[PDB]
Design a binder for this molecule. Structure first.
Ligand code: PMR
Ligand code: PMR
Ligand SMILES: [Cu+2]
Ligand SMILES: [Cu+2]
Lengths: 419, 402, 418, 389
């Protein structure tokens, strides 16, 4: 019952709806008490979609208690089916729905609508948004995707990009570009931009690209176990990891590692005269486990500034962060409390802190440059532009996104306290 | 009786604590409510606001003694860290309500040991029994019973309206000059009112459906008048107030050149505005029936629908009288049929709780956000002129965008 | 008394141009200290090649006809250095406005066309015509009216180095044209080769990218090479669609437009994009960008354009053309003091423009972003930052609304807890 | 000879403006000068600096008009120093003529750091020399220190100097207008600043005798400087060494602890004017196999202790052309080719680790902890190359 004035990742049902509103034709009837529909504002207002995040709640009131709320769930699911006519229904609950023991599974199962019914019964008081997205997408593949004949050409189903997420829309494009230029065909792009037919089509490939381990690691492991497609381990975040991913998938597909390097400017933009003052800066790296794990590699090898302190609120991906820290001889902060990041960066006062938006505002309070490289963000961090983070353009975006806090701080200081 | 688009009352805390700067709204509940408060406050959660937003873990979910024990320990820690809070507010929530966590028992037990240093009031913002802005009403009805009892005949300003709103209200009132004005929202002890059998609950905001009953239990009286939300709504509210006190109409019409005439001028200064267009009120703020009448008469509204989370007969009675009989006060409104009705009617406005604002803007329909309305100073005379413009601006957004 | 100068001198633009042309050289009589611009294209626009532009650096012991001799000495040494493909002559004018131009040894090289020369007007120019008198000469001389190739081809005309995000504008417009079926013979102003610039006949129509530098090239090419240019500009959703209409009309092909990516028209339609309705916005910067951005603002953004002044007042009439389109006038002065005065007078909420206006608004509290040319190292980015096409319209939303995020969240923070 | 590389004199304006507060440093000419200053400054141009940039008889009338414009826009200038540039000296615009005629409290002084005459850091030379002429003579044994060295370390220099036992200091760079350094026949002055050849020449021309000047860059660079100071003022050896051994120990430890990765190096000095002094600084710590060390302007003079303490490995080539000096660089393959200008970063783009001069010039590197991070400055490109290869 601690005074958590800021949760790092929202309720896992929000993450579940990130998978939901990603796929066309997939409807997430939710047994959310009226008001839990703010998450609709999340999806139409943070990520700004021109369509009701098709998550048809029930919004039961005090008048709708007992079995009345279950009757409302039945009604809402039926109205969704006869209103939008989804190709696969997708059901789940909220925190208060768990508190009612609302059982969104059996109800919509007994509704007996012909389209597939998937359940999303995920803990909400123990988990957070990213687990909700990952588990929901894994269950989606588990129900729909089946082992079928591989594509005549090599195919590379992308795994992990959910709809609401820090730059998923653009890394899906970047990795599609990499795979198509190298010689592999993007059979599907689940769960963002996909559909139940695409989930079924996931089986026709030769390897299952793991873009976002946080939101798709379960899916990739299940695919390699069942679809017989070795998931790619290294994510394309950073030039070193981009080359690792390129070589890895060129080995899985047995194709020449063609990777257009006319776009990559991060190694030159950093390994130069100006970006030499980077070398020695004592950076601190908090945030989303995978992004910050590969951010450590970029920062040390390809950027220069020395790493002091790198935690991550993601607990299920703790060990890879501990390993990335111990590679440089560092520790891992694996709690989910903002005050801990606060006193961590007081004790280890950095110049460039890479982390979430809450890290950005923490640094705004103290007055040190801060970047956004991780999940919990605002409308600003969801861009309309091409802002990827996986691939060679992903490495370029990483370079610029990290250097902009440094330029911001430098201009702010020197302006009017050196002149 | 299906899905309804409206918030839980927890989002009233975002405006509530901005008035009562001596109050902590320690919102219990799950991580979902916490994420609501986080997203709703937006950047405010970063400048240490008075939420608390204490989430219950699964270990704290089971049982009741453990929950209140932890609540006690963190409340003591907070008040030790911030010894500048007097009117503590243990806000309930849908999770907390389902647990049946007693905020009133907690209030008694906590004022037992915080004493006069921290006077706790308890209410609800749970969507189970509350909507977007009836949390304001529950909060005000949580301080009304504890309000200083007296017998002096005087008026109030019931409603946790902005400070500038109250300032303009009292300045106009003393320009008229009527009774002892006692603003019901007690931002601190320096402006604590006195209620009693000869007082009146001069309500200002339609969703104040429970503070009316509470300060009726106090024994006071109602100024039976439309809820003040514009030229004529506030005109009749104020006129009925003074007729309950007996003030001559000479001062009425001699001191109302800047307030009233310019209020109507500013309200009807929206040339495009909504003159002749339609509105389809989804359940948003218990505030649609009030809007429809003065958008109809002054701003020229068709007012096809007056859909409301709940309609109170008497208090919006005179407010309903100026409202047309065409639109129907549908309650328990299922949003889906309501989208069907919008799609059939093709209005120029679809006010709602609106996580379906952008979704309803995608289908071409113009949409306006009543949440900002409940937030923005929109009351009385000088700030309802921009209430009208606040409604007008999305129309111009559609005009330039389409 | 310009304490900050918007654009550089008329030689830096020519060096911008030559930086993207591997081989083409430019003999410039610039004293040591005018070689600070040799940094720009590896310092500001951090690249890895010494600019292909000859420098002479005549010292105090070198005044008069000695500079004339150093002209030929530097020309011969520069040719022997890396065997260029074309030579351009022109001075900084300082001690020699027009009085050392010596082609004698600039010609008599393996170079087929030695008449190539860029003369820049004295004390009357900035970093636009430096790159524009580039492709009024370097493409007027070594570009052949080659046969139009079998498929309908085109030329990506206009983008010069050290230009505002030009390298990504190139890729976005090329992607649009290829997805529509339009072949791109060469990106002639940037990332090209002298063989590619000779291959300007194999293009059914030049695709113009910006008047800043490519306007003269496109006008001349339509006049001479008989391949019209796209009169519209791809900055902005409506402008992008009209640009597609023009390119497909001159092509004869289907107007295929990948708006699947395009999100500005929708992201400016959400109700977050409603509180910006009527927001007074000041727009100072280069003419092409200011007109395109102000059209976008005034109609599709929600902002209300209260300022449209500029510093590229050469084509003066098309400036106030859009001003009467919005019902205003243009501040065509060339000093940031007038920008400060105008934004103080109108007190806008967004001062979109140069980094100089960026720092004014930082010093005046107003929000602000970068949409214009006079920018430092940080606005020449590594990331894919295209200002043109559908993704150009996409970036023009986030870039403009980040300063509004500043001016809103800062206000909320400072007003909530005080 | 042929094309040159280094900056014109206006790059020293960025330092002179920062150091001596109450002064004006308006340069004249085109956007090539107003933009070198702009880009080099970065944010100074936004911080509203103290300098400016102005827009034969006609040229002199324009000169008078623009000087009056200076006096108008800043009605708080009394010890201004106008800066000459290439066009002004091309039409030979006498800044002294404008200063003297338009001085009639208003005291206008001239200065011409024009890169056609001036070089990288000889603008400091010309300005500090232009302080000297008009000023009258003093009549006592003071120690008129010179150079626009950092004020934080100007305090260290003054503290040490008074610990020696000297009289008045009255540093030539007038950071206060009231502080006017007179040029006395008995005035014995050192040289903190290696590129003060014109300043030293003019100071001895007016009459002030000059002390031996091994220029102060930590350890022996400043050791022999302050030793010459002491033996000129007759400070007892046991007095000087007692009051100066601790700064020596601090700088020696700091340079060693900052140049750990600077072992096995060939530091090519393309023409900072610090080249002989820095070449000597880079001989003892770790391994510095220095190679050709050119300058944009070299005189031994009595500034000779540099070359006297310099080896023979690095060639002391005065006058150079990058268009062939970079060929010599390719042939040499120096593991750290610190390149003032001409080629600069493309050297890092063609497999040559590169350091840049203005970092050394505009970052405190003079004795004590200041020269301690000189090793860090020279390790910057090397510590980059060690990882971001
Ligand atoms: C006049 C050309 C030029 C350019 C374009 C700039 C801007 C700029 N100069 Mg460098 N700078 C120039 C000259 C100088 N710089 C100045 C400022 C500054 C410094 C201290 C630094 C530097 C650099 C830069 C920068 C990038 C600043 C950075 O990202 O850290 C630009 C393009 C930067 C670096 O990485 O390169 C040496 C660095 O740390 N300059 C200085 C005084 C030391 C000079 C005279
Ligand atoms: C729950 C999701 C969501 C998000 C992320 C926020 C923040 C924020 N919500 Mg709106 N907002 C949502 C809902 C609500 N916001 C709230 C507050 C508020 C208002 C009054 C306003 C705003 C807005 C926004 C925006 C735009 C960011 C900006 O205004 O700076 C964010 C991310 C903005 C807008 O026009 O949308 C309605 C504006 O005028 N929020 C309220 C009541 C407290 C809630 C419940
Ligand atoms: Cu910024
Ligand atoms: Cu910002």
């Amino acid at each position: 019952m601690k005074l958590t004035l800021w949760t790092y990742e929202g309720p896992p049902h929000v993450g579940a709806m990130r998978v939901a509103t990603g796929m066309t034709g997939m409807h997430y009837v939710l047994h959310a008490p009226q008001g839990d529909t703010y998450a609709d504002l999340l999806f139409t207002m943070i990520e700004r979609r021109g369509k009701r995040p098709p998550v048809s709640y029930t919004t039961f009131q005090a008048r709708d208690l007992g079995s009345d709320t279950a009757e409302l769930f039945q009604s809402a699911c039926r109205d969704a089916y006869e209103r939008f006519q989804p190709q696969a229904i997708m059901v789940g609950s909220s925190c208060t729905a768990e508190l009612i023991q609302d059982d969104t599974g059996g109800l919509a199962d007994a509704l007996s609508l012909p389209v597939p019914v998937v359940h999303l019964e995920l803990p909400s008081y123990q988990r957070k948004e990213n687990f909700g997205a990952d588990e929901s997408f894994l269950q989606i593949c588990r129900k729909l995707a089946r082992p079928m004949e591989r594509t005549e050409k090599v195919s590379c189903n992308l795994l992990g990009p959910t709809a609401l997420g820090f730059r998923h829309r653009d890394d899906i494009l970047e990795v599609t570009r990499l795979l198509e230029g190298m010689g592999i065909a993007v059979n599907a792009v689940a769960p963002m931009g996909a559909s139940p037919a695409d989930i079924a089509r996931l089986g026709a490939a030769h390897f299952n690209v793991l873009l976002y381990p946080e939101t798709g690691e379960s899916a990739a492991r299940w695919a390699e176990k069942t679809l017989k497609q070795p998931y790619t381990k290294t994510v394309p975040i950073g030039v070193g990891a981009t080359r690792d991913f390129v070589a890895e998938v060129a080995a899985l597909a047995g194709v020449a590692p063609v990777a257009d390097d006319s776009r990559l400017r991060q190694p030159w933009w950093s390994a130069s005269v100006d970006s030499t003052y980077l070398t020695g800066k004592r950076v601190f790296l908090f945030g989303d486990a995978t992004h910050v794990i590969a951010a450590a590699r970029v920062a040390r090898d390809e950027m220069g500034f020395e790493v002091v302190g790198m935690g991550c609120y993601n607990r299920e991906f703790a060990r890879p962060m501990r390993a990335a820290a111990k590679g440089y001889g560092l520790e891992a902060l694996v709690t989910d409390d903002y005050l801990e990041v606060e006193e961590a960066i007081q004790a280890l006062a950095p110049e460039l802190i890479l982390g979430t938006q809450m890290e950005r505002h923490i640094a705004k309070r103290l007055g040190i440059p801060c970047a956004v490289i991780s999940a919990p963000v605002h409308v600003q961090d969801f861009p309309a532009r091409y802002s990827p983070q996986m691939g060679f353009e992903g490495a370029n975006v990483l370079f610029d996104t990290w250097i902009h806090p440094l330029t911001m701080g430098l201009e702010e200081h020197l302006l009017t306290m050196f002149r | 009786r299906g899905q309804r688009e409206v918030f839980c009352g927890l989002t009233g805390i975002i405006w509530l604590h901005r008035k009562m700067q001596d109050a902590f709204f320690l919102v219990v509940g799950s991580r979902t409510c916490a994420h609501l408060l986080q997203s709703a406050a937006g950047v405010m959660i970063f400048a240490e606001p008075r939420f608390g937003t204490a989430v219950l873990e699964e270990k704290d979910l089971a049982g009741l003694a453990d929950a209140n024990a932890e609540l006690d320990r963190e409340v003591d820690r907070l008040l030790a860290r911030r010894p500048d809070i007097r009117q503590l507010f243990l806000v309930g929530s849908c999770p907390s309500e389902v647990i049946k966590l007693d905020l009133h028992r907690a209030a008694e037990r906590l004022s037992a040991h915080h004493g006069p240093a921290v006077r706790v009031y308890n209410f609800s913002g749970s969507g189970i029994e509350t909507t977007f802005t009836q949390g304001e009403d529950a909060c005000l009805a949580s301080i009304v019973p504890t309000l200083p009892a007296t017998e002096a005949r005087e008026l109030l300003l019931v409603g946790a309206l902005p400070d500038v709103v109250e300032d303009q209200a009292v300045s106009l009132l003393t320009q008229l000059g009527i009774g002892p004005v006692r603003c019901l929202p007690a931002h601190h002890a320096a402006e604590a009112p006195g209620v009693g059998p000869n007082t009146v609950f001069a309500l200002v905001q339609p969703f104040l459906g429970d503070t009316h009953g509470a300060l009726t239990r106090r024994g006071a009286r109602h100024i039976a008048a439309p809820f003040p939300f514009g030229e004529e709504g506030t005109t009749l509210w104020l006129k009925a107030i003074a007729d309950e006190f007996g003030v001559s109409a000479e001062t009425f019409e001699a001191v109302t050149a800047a307030p009233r005439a310019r209020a109507r001028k500013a309200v009807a200064a929206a040339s495009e505005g909504l003159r002749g267009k339609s509105v389809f009120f989804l359940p948003d703020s218990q505030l649609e029936p009030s809007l429809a009448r003065f958008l109809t008469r002054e701003c020229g509204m068709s007012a096809v629908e007056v859909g409301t989370p709940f309609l109170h007969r008497g208090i919006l009675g005179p407010d309903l009288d100026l409202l047309a009989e065409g639109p129907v006060l549908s309650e328990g409104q299922d949003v889906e049929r309501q989208l069907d009705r919008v799609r059939a009617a093709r209005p120029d406005l679809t006010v709602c709780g609106l996580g379906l604002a952008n979704p309803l803007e995608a289908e071409g329909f113009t949409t306006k956000w009543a949440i900002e309305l409940v937030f923005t100073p929109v009351h009385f005379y000088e700030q309802a002129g921009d209430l009208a413009g606040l409604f007008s601006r999305p129309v111009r957004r559609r005009a330039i965008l389409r």
